[PDB]
Amino acid sequence: SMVNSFSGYLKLTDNVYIKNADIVEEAKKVKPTVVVNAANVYLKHGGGVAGALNKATNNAMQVESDDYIATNGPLKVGGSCVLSGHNLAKHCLHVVGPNVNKGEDIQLLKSAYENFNQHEVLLAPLLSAGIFGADPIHSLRVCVDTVRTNVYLAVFDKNLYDKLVSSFL
């Protein structure tokens, strides 16, 4: 594969890399072609990764997203759309993982990760982790077993990062 500027990642597999990092700061530094947002179907970027990415864009992500929804309607759980990356990336891939706090079926997590295969290289969070309520160890497993393109995972919490690495098979 071609050399790229992602730095300090642990290599998990042929195509999956992981780092304890703030995805906002990572994106600002690297300016990747694609940053993944942990979106919901309404593209309401209130909290978690989405709230942080949107805040870093000075709410431009939300303004763009509101126009997207007005034109196209909600996304599907497991679905995605490509919008601007604003000051963070060329593009933002908004991906909707299932929210366990909404009762959504965890099997949709695989469908959510399949969206990553449409992009050769991505900076991403673990889908359905954090406030979406899924087990991040499971999310990492689904990622490795689903994504075939090159994915650089940013894990917000240091303790969780260490547990993901130390439990990885």
From Swiss-Prot:
UniProt membrane topology term: Multi-pass membrane protein
Domain Macro: 3-169
Assembly with partners or alone: May form homohexamers. Interacts with N protein.
Outcome recorded upon mutating T33A: In strain: Mu/B.1.621
Known regulation of activity: Inhibited in vitro by GRL-0617.
Highest taxon of source: Viruses
Catalyzed chemical reaction(s): Thiol-dependent hydrolysis of ester, thioester, amide, peptide and isopeptide bonds formed by the C-terminal Gly of ubiquitin (a 76-residue protein attached to proteins as an intracellular targeting signal)
General function of this protein: Responsible for the cleavages located at the N-terminus of the replicase polyprotein. Participates together with nsp4 in the assembly of virally-induced cytoplasmic double-membrane vesicles necessary for viral replication. Antagonizes innate immune induction of type I interferon by blocking the phosphorylation, dimerization and subsequent nuclear translocation of host IRF3. Also prevents host NF-kappa-B signaling. In addition, PL-PRO possesses a deubiquitinating/deISGylating activity and processes both 'Lys-48'- and 'Lys-63'-linked polyubiquitin chains from cellular substrates.
Protein's name in the database: Papain-like protease nsp3
Subcellular localization, as worded in the UniProt entry: Host endoplasmic reticulum membrane
